[PDB]
């Protein structure tokens, strides 16, 4: 019967300028409510949102993914691995009322794209057309990755999202943003010092710092540094595996290569499971607030 085909349908009479105004709304609010999480801001939680709603994809039967906008439903909203993303949804809802025409999938994925560009990251091409689907299409819990694992796990998990060795190392570099919260995941502390500026620090910290495996206050095992940073068991697996180690060194030396690799991989992540017609517009590259003189 073949998997479900999710055809991208652009919202009635909307074009680039209508989506630029939604980007601009998320960006100014990001600038306004900069007090959140001991001044880290809402930037990191938004990219994590865009990934966790796209990360439920399964290439075998095309279930899950960003298309449906199914995170608004109680089963996916209350997924244990989604703990903390309520704050991200709550940030996004006032602007959903200001722009009721935009689908949920388009809004969650846009928030991620907006968050990375505003945090000085690479320009990431974004496509519209995701359509809300009913409550029955909502993915069952347990499709997101665990942190207390090894390199073998990471490689097999990302195969489900059609990601190769290079794509996963690049995507993992987003961990340069924000931190781990014990109340949410059972892990505590940042991966780097520039928690709200998008850089290649994740990789520089991975092989230039001295790491020791310790126990936190949730009894979980995490890699700590003398400078106060942390790594998850899946993050440090990137220097244990010989294939992953080579790419990590490549990104630590060349930030521009990381930037171009993250963007294609993230765009691919957000677009997974969607079929864009031939008549559909070519991807949108949005103007940042700094580029508009703000």
């Amino acid at each position: 019967t073949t998997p479900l085909v999710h055809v991208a349908s652009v919202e009635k009479g909307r074009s680039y300028e209508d989506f630029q105004k939604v980007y601009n709304a998320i960006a100014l609010k990001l600038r306004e409510d900069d007090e959140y999480d001991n001044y880290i801001g809402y930037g990191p939680v938004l990219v994590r949102l865009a990934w966790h709603t796209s990360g439920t994809w399964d290439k075998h039967d095309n279930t899950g993914g960003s298309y449906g906008g199914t995170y608004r439903f109680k089963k996916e909203f209350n997924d244990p691995s989604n703990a903390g993303l309520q704050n991200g949804f709550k940030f996004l809802e006032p602007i959903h009322k200001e722009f009721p025409w935009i689908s949920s999938g388009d809004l969650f994925s846009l928030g991620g794209v907006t968050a990375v560009q505003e945090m000085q990251g690479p320009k990431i091409p974004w496509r519209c057309g995701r359509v809300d689907t009913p409550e029955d299409t909502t993915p069952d819990n347990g499709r997101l990755p665990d942190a207390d694992k090894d390199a073998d796990y990471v490689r097999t998990f990302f195969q489900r999202l059609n990601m190769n060795d290079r794509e996963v190392v690049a995507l993992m570099g987003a961990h340069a943003l924000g931190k781990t919260h014990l109340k949410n995941s059972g892990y505590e502390g940042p991966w780097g010092a520039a928690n709200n500026v998008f850089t290649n620090e994740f990789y520089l910290n991975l092989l230039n710092e001295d790491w020791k495996l310790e126990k936190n206050d949730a009894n979980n095992e995490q890699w700590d540094s003398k400078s106060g940073y942390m790594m998850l068991p899946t993050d440090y697996s990137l220097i244990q595996d010989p294939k992953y180690l080579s790419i990590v060194k490549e990104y630590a030396n060349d930030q521009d290569k990381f930037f171009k690799d993250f963007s294609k991989a993230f765009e691919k992540l957000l677009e997974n499971g969607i079929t864009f017609p031939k008549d559909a517009p070519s991807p949108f590259i949005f103007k940042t607030l700094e580029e508009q003189g703000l």
């Binding site: 001991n38 001044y39 801001g41 000085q120 940042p190 010092a193 520039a194």
Partner: protein
Amino acid sequence: TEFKAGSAKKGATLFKTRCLQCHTVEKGGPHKVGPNLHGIFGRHSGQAEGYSYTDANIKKNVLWDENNMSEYLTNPKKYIPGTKMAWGGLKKEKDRNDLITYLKKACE
């Protein structure tokens, strides 16, 4: 002056959340990701000994006063192009005043 003057205790929380990951402000303090900022006011940019700056921070050569510092914390990469200070910027003037008044106190 052009810059006003705010609360020193509000500026302490701003430093602690937004600057202390990379900077120390006390006498003889260690260089972390960023240099020690004790005696930064009335000193030229790129002069703290023992720290390795970029050529851009030294070549800029500006005497750090409360005004050009408020210009720097707004947007680092626009003020000193090529600097490695991975920072977003204090976009609100109240937060700039509050932090400059605390830094004035903490760094002599």
